[PDB]
Amino acid sequence: DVQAEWSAISGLRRHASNPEVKISLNRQAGYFYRNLIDRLQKKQKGADRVLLSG
Amino acid sequence: MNVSIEEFTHFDFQLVPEPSPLDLVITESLKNHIEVNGVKSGALLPLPFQTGIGKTYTALNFLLQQMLEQVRSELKEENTGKKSKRLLYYVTDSVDNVVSAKADLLKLIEKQTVKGEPRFTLEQQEYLKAQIVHLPNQSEQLLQCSDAVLNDVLIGFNLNAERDVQAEWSAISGLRRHASNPEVKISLNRQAGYFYRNLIDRLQKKQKGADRVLLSGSLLASVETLLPGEKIRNGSAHVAFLTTSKFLKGFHNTRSRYSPLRDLSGAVLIIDEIDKQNQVILSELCKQQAQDLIWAIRTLRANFRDHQLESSPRYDKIEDLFEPLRERLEEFGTNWNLAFAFNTEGANLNERPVRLFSDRSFTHVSSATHKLSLKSDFLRRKNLIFSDEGLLTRFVNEADVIYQWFLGTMRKAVFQYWENVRGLEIEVRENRSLEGTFQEAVQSLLTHFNLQEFESAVYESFDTRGLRQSKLSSSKSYHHTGLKLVEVAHNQGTRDTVNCKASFLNTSPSGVLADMVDAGAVILGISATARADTVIHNFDFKYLNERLGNKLLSLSREQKQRVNNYYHSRRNYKDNGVVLTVKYLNSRDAFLDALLEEYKPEARSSHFILNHYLGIAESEQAFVRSWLSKLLASIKAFISSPDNRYMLSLLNRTLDTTRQNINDFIQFCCDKWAKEFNVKTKTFFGVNADWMRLVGYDEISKHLNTELGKVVVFSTYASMGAGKNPDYAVNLALEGESLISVADVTYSTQLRSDIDSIYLEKPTQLLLSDDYSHTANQLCQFHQILSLQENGELSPKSAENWCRQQLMGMSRERSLQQYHQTSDYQSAVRKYIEQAVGRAGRTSLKRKQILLFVDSGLKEILAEESRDPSLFSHEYVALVNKAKSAGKSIVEDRAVRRLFNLAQRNNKDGMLSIKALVHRLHNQPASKSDIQEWQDIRTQLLRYPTVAFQPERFNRLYLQSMTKGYYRYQGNLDGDPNSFEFFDRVPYGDMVSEEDCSLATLVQNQYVRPWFERKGFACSWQKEANVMTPIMFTNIYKGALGEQAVEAVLTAFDFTFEEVPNSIYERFDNRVIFAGIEQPIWLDSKSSKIALVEEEFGPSKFIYVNALGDTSKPIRYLNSCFVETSPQLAKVIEIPALIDDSNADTNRTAVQELIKWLHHS
Amino acid sequence: RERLEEFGTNWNLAFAFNTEGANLNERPVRLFSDRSFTHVSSATHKLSLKSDFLRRKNLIFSGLLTRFVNEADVIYQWFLGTMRKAVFQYWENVRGLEIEVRENRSLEGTFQEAVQSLLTHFNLQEFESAVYESFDTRGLR
């Protein structure tokens, strides 16, 4: 479902020329960023803290 | 138009189309039902109608008869006021089949003709079509609503006066212009779903206040198109066409969410492909959310301490349903020191937590290697779980019991609220529903006690166990105790507290089906294999039979014969010369090697080709070579034919782009044999179900209606479950004389044809598995283990090992390695085959000679097919008969193995329930309820040592024996109950029989026998096939016969007996008072307990006594320490044998000695 | 804790609250008060609040209701203010430890852990979002 949301948002980007496709893209990008960053932080609070570099 | 019910006033309700044998079979069964089970009672009629005889046609024609009977009943009952409409349904798990069946029904209304004149005029055809309503999901409901409908709703309900509502609706109107982009389509679907949630929430909030917008005309029409679930509330529509998911979940109307499972009293429910619904209902039960049991119990305890419901007439009796729960909560929280939060000592739970598992009866498992206990530390004020590397499982079992007792009491109190409110007789002219009283009842009860946070859990429960209001006595299956999986981890964000997030499953899909039928529905389950013998891919019909009884209707041998006659006369293969031949394809390796050599001239060996070109791993080489040999030999024998044209090869593997080199090699082999036989071949790689759903089969449709050449399709078993005909139009121009008439010529109306070669690969991936989540998958896996153990297919040893392994991450290859050992797997294989070769048989015009190509594995499985063929399809009878004739295999009978496993499971359940019950009679005080349970067990086993038919009330006291009245068992009756073995697997062992309990000796007595025939206790074992389990015999029947015999003797000398007080229950048997003596005497009937009694009652006298034996043994006397002493100095007296072994004469000597020694006090 | 048990004894919080003879589905009672001398109420009368021990309800009948609501609000803000004092006291207690994993020690690395440990202990997890929000409207105090 993560890559369902990200696939839906990748798909919309191709049509941000339509103003109302743009409105839809903005709203969903907001919700998916809430989602993505929530899951990133849950990963980083545990033991498998991904060592970020490069 | 005003097309209304007066349009039928000159309709003749007794002209019916000349009913085909299927309609008559259904009607006979239901009229026989109503005259046996009553008028108001539900039923269930599993209809194994094979394909090709109008399954759905017959279902829709029965649906139309019920619609016309409602119209008649309205033209009659109009003098009575009782518009008691019956809801008819049509549920099935797929959206394509629901839509296609609805559109078939509208075509049936329009074109149904009787006696050359159409059955319905134009107005009647308009009326009835309005009664039918189709309920799709929320996104597809919205994207059906045109701009006019949503605008009219938004104006009428004045929601456009807000901004963000029309922001979302503007964003969704904007996307609709681009639904051609598939990814714009996916965005539009998700967004339309959320906006429909939002819109309908606001509509309902408007309609629950005083400003109920009066709906009529165009606004009513627009809301009904937005809410087809609304037409059902008004009285406008009966017939809902929906999916199982939208049936269990429930549909919306203008005021609330109608949940069809609470309102089944009198529904008629046609479930197409019923057996596939076990999996779908299972998939909905596994989705429901986990509950933290520590938050839940601490919340219940705190908020139930004071808060109270108020003493009006609405709450007229409710507060006394919640008084036992309040008392149990305060007692539980005192024992388990629930003031303090819980934390673990030791092991590292940021890596992995503790996982516990329990099926609420005898299959307990835990992931901890050690027996975790739980200790309350009053200096730290924490409750410390010794993560040791017990008592925690006892805590969690009790906490769960209390939580389910709370939810069950909320349902009892919602119905008591409903009775009280209906009796109020509120303002007239106002209809207020019953599920209208549901949400008000829930919210008023939760608001009073302050438990609003438990609202979601309460709403969800009303569909899993909620159909019940709408221990070792009672009936005791799995299919309605369910299972529980508890995962003890650290609270997220903190470093020192712990949650027990339990995930439940309070029932199985067979429990849901028999709850509907117990609740009133008339389920009509249509499927070709409705009564398969699996319990994983089908309901458990052994349980439904024991649960329902005479409500599980059936077809006689007459009616199954009549349906087979109709089937033969509609698919008359044999008379018209249509041929079926089958070839069992073994492994041929040098075959594939020669193909490989001719595929790659530069390569020097087959392994080299498989490595460098096909991408086959070296360990995987055997498997790929094997099945690729079989598949290409099937293609060879197909295109080698002159005549045959269409083949479907059914595989465990979707030959998509992922294995594209194997696709390519198959393409090249198809090419060589295509050119060699001078035939054009086309192969389709990666036909999954979706390509059929959206695009694909229109292409082979046009291919065969227009082009020359042979067609091959590759797809899987699951992929065929999309819900579509695999048929194409017969083109006589191309085919010529290659097709003939199989049916009766009288109904040859349809010019289409179907698959005419088919290759079947042996399925192995047959366990169910849910992908929804991780806990949803673990609940599916434990459901399948326990459904197999319940049924009999897994011994308790095997079921418990598999449950244990599954807690610690058993890999799916390892799950499937152990399902294959059950006979349930072979019945699910034969189900999958029997459904595969019925797709290859829909149409009414057929080839002369049909190829059914079988894997070589299926020879061993199919050969065992042993049901009665009187409803098998012709292709399946071909596969079976050609396998059977090829020579017989050595068979493990399934009923025999299944009796062995059920003997061990009934014994394990007896053993563990008894040990739990006795341990709970050692809790002081012993509850009177548990004293009653112990007494019911003993009383039942005395009056019925054997039962002639499997009892439904006390069913795990008894075990079904192979030999009537006795059996031989071998085990440690205090040891491990996985280690018993029973019936002549141990030909020498202890015996459970009337001759080893020595009941024939004891009834010879002059005093005891009148006691028995006064009490009803059976004085000699009946010779029947269900006997006491080893536990019940050794530990209760022998004890209770001894007690009754001794007390029956002691009555014969004017003792008077008393109930042993609750303080010491089971420590002592009986209490007596002897004439001339006031001192109370307790009994043991066959120093610690003497001290613990005299600690309460002081100095007293006691009896130890054995009922049967040698009466000549010396009479003994003891002090407190069980040291021998003189009778005058004694507190304890023994009678070694009160009745003679040889002649049952009363030990009058010992009676005199007992009497006198009590007089020596 | 002592003020809560005293408040709930005075105002009988064992019993839920209901109104007598008012059609609040048309218009409710709205009260307003700036916590110092500008009190206003939209009810034409001075609403009282009677605890009825036969009905086991607390009945808002035509004062004392404004006194109930003023006190209940004081107690709720006292709870949130004490949660901030206790998050700071938790932080000052933890900073000196260095167990193994305080990989930031600042005013607010210890914020979510302090909030969740204190709420989980007293069982008040449902007050979590109300505590997170407050940490900036009075939480700079």
Coordinates of C-alpha atoms in Angstrom, one line a residue, chain B residues 957-1153:
Chain B
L957 CA -16.6 -36.1 27.8
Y958 CA -17.1 -39.0 25.4
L959 CA -15.0 -40.4 22.6
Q960 CA -16.3 -42.4 19.6
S961 CA -15.1 -46.0 19.8
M962 CA -14.5 -48.4 17.0
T963 CA -15.9 -51.3 19.2
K964 CA -19.1 -50.9 21.1
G965 CA -18.8 -50.6 24.8
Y966 CA -15.0 -50.9 25.5
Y967 CA -11.7 -49.7 24.2
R968 CA -8.0 -50.1 25.0
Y969 CA -5.9 -47.1 25.9
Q970 CA -2.3 -46.6 27.0
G971 CA -1.0 -43.4 28.6
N972 CA 0.0 -41.6 31.7
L973 CA -3.2 -40.2 33.1
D974 CA -1.2 -37.5 34.9
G975 CA 1.4 -37.2 32.1
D976 CA 1.5 -35.6 28.7
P977 CA -1.8 -35.9 26.8
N978 CA -0.1 -35.7 23.5
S979 CA 1.4 -39.1 24.3
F980 CA -1.7 -41.3 24.5
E981 CA -2.4 -44.0 22.0
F982 CA -5.7 -45.7 21.9
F983 CA -7.7 -48.3 19.9
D984 CA -5.9 -51.3 18.5
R985 CA -2.8 -49.3 17.7
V986 CA -2.0 -50.6 21.1
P987 CA -3.6 -54.0 21.2
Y988 CA -2.7 -54.6 24.8
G989 CA -3.3 -51.8 27.3
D990 CA -5.5 -50.7 30.1
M991 CA -9.3 -51.2 29.4
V992 CA -12.2 -48.9 29.8
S993 CA -15.1 -51.3 30.1
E994 CA -17.8 -52.2 32.5
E995 CA -15.7 -55.2 33.5
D996 CA -12.8 -53.1 34.6
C997 CA -14.8 -50.5 36.6
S998 CA -16.3 -53.5 38.5
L999 CA -19.8 -52.0 38.3
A1000 CA -21.2 -55.6 37.8
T1001 CA -19.9 -56.3 41.3
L1002 CA -21.3 -53.3 43.1
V1003 CA -24.9 -53.4 41.9
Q1004 CA -25.2 -56.9 43.3
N1005 CA -25.3 -55.2 46.7
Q1006 CA -28.7 -55.0 48.5
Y1007 CA -28.4 -51.4 49.7
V1008 CA -26.6 -49.6 46.9
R1009 CA -28.7 -50.8 44.0
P1010 CA -31.9 -49.1 45.2
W1011 CA -29.9 -46.0 45.5
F1012 CA -28.9 -46.2 41.8
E1013 CA -32.3 -47.0 40.4
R1014 CA -33.6 -44.1 42.5
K1015 CA -30.9 -41.8 41.1
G1016 CA -31.1 -43.1 37.5
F1017 CA -27.5 -44.1 37.4
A1018 CA -27.1 -46.7 34.7
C1019 CA -26.4 -50.0 36.5
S1020 CA -24.7 -51.7 33.5
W1021 CA -23.0 -50.1 30.4
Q1022 CA -25.1 -49.8 27.3
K1023 CA -23.4 -51.3 24.3
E1024 CA -22.9 -48.2 22.1
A1025 CA -20.1 -46.6 20.2
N1026 CA -19.4 -43.5 22.3
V1027 CA -17.6 -44.3 25.6
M1028 CA -16.0 -42.3 28.4
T1029 CA -12.6 -40.9 27.7
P1030 CA -9.7 -42.3 29.8
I1031 CA -9.7 -39.3 32.1
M1032 CA -13.4 -39.3 32.9
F1033 CA -13.3 -43.0 33.5
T1034 CA -10.2 -43.2 35.7
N1035 CA -10.7 -40.0 37.6
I1036 CA -14.4 -39.3 37.9
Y1037 CA -16.5 -42.3 37.1
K1038 CA -14.5 -44.6 39.4
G1039 CA -14.4 -41.9 42.1
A1040 CA -18.1 -41.1 41.8
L1041 CA -19.3 -44.7 41.8
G1042 CA -17.2 -45.3 44.9
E1043 CA -18.7 -42.2 46.6
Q1044 CA -22.3 -43.3 45.7
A1045 CA -21.7 -46.8 46.8
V1046 CA -20.2 -45.9 50.2
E1047 CA -22.9 -43.3 50.9
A1048 CA -25.6 -45.7 49.8
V1049 CA -24.3 -48.1 52.4
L1050 CA -24.1 -45.5 55.1
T1051 CA -27.7 -44.6 54.6
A1052 CA -28.6 -48.2 55.5
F1053 CA -27.6 -47.5 59.1
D1054 CA -29.5 -44.1 59.6
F1055 CA -26.7 -41.7 58.9
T1056 CA -27.7 -38.3 57.6
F1057 CA -25.4 -36.6 55.0
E1058 CA -24.6 -33.0 54.4
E1059 CA -23.0 -30.8 51.8
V1060 CA -19.3 -30.2 52.3
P1061 CA -18.8 -26.5 52.9
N1062 CA -17.2 -24.4 50.2
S1063 CA -14.1 -23.7 52.2
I1064 CA -12.5 -27.2 51.6
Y1065 CA -14.3 -28.4 48.5
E1066 CA -12.8 -31.5 46.9
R1067 CA -10.5 -32.0 49.9
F1068 CA -13.3 -34.1 51.4
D1069 CA -16.2 -36.0 50.0
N1070 CA -19.2 -36.0 52.4
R1071 CA -20.2 -34.9 55.9
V1072 CA -22.4 -37.1 58.1
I1073 CA -24.2 -36.9 61.4
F1074 CA -24.9 -40.2 63.3
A1075 CA -27.8 -40.5 65.7
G1076 CA -26.7 -40.2 69.3
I1077 CA -23.5 -38.2 68.3
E1078 CA -23.3 -34.5 67.6
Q1079 CA -19.7 -34.4 66.3
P1080 CA -19.4 -33.7 62.6
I1081 CA -17.7 -36.3 60.4
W1082 CA -16.2 -35.6 57.0
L1083 CA -15.6 -38.4 54.5
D1084 CA -13.1 -39.6 51.9
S1085 CA -14.7 -42.2 49.5
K1086 CA -12.7 -44.3 47.1
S1087 CA -2.2 -34.8 57.6
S1088 CA -2.6 -31.7 55.6
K1089 CA -6.3 -31.7 54.8
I1090 CA -7.1 -32.9 58.4
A1091 CA -5.1 -29.9 59.8
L1092 CA -6.6 -27.5 57.3
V1093 CA -10.2 -28.6 58.2
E1094 CA -9.6 -28.6 62.0
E1095 CA -8.1 -25.1 61.5
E1096 CA -11.7 -24.1 60.6
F1097 CA -13.9 -26.5 62.6
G1098 CA -11.7 -27.8 65.4
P1099 CA -11.5 -31.4 66.7
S1100 CA -13.7 -33.8 64.7
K1101 CA -13.8 -37.4 63.4
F1102 CA -13.2 -38.6 59.8
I1103 CA -13.7 -41.6 57.6
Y1104 CA -11.5 -43.2 54.9
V1105 CA -13.3 -46.0 53.1
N1106 CA -13.0 -48.1 50.0
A1107 CA -16.1 -49.5 48.4
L1108 CA -14.9 -52.7 46.6
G1109 CA -12.4 -55.3 47.6
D1110 CA -11.6 -57.9 50.3
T1111 CA -13.7 -57.1 53.4
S1112 CA -11.3 -59.3 55.5
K1113 CA -8.6 -56.6 55.6
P1114 CA -7.8 -55.3 59.1
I1115 CA -9.7 -52.3 60.3
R1116 CA -7.2 -49.4 61.1
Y1117 CA -7.2 -46.4 63.3
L1118 CA -4.9 -43.3 63.2
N1119 CA -3.9 -40.1 64.8
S1120 CA -3.4 -36.7 63.1
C1121 CA 0.0 -37.6 61.6
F1122 CA -1.3 -40.8 59.9
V1123 CA 0.5 -42.8 62.6
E1124 CA -1.3 -46.0 63.7
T1125 CA -2.8 -45.8 67.2
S1126 CA -5.4 -47.4 69.3
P1127 CA -9.1 -46.8 68.4
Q1128 CA -9.8 -44.8 71.5
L1129 CA -6.7 -42.6 70.8
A1130 CA -7.7 -42.4 67.1
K1131 CA -9.1 -39.5 65.1
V1132 CA -9.1 -41.3 61.7
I1133 CA -10.9 -44.6 61.0
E1134 CA -10.6 -46.8 57.9
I1135 CA -13.0 -49.3 56.5
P1136 CA -10.8 -51.2 54.0
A1137 CA -13.8 -52.7 52.1
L1138 CA -17.5 -51.9 52.8
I1139 CA -18.8 -54.4 50.2
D1140 CA -17.6 -57.8 49.3
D1141 CA -15.9 -58.4 45.9
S1142 CA -17.2 -61.9 45.6
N1143 CA -20.8 -61.7 46.7
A1144 CA -21.5 -58.0 47.5
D1145 CA -22.5 -58.7 51.0
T1146 CA -22.3 -55.7 53.3
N1147 CA -19.3 -55.5 55.6
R1148 CA -21.5 -55.5 58.7
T1149 CA -18.4 -56.2 60.8
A1150 CA -16.8 -52.9 59.6
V1151 CA -20.1 -51.1 60.0
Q1152 CA -20.3 -52.2 63.6
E1153 CA -16.6 -51.2 64.1

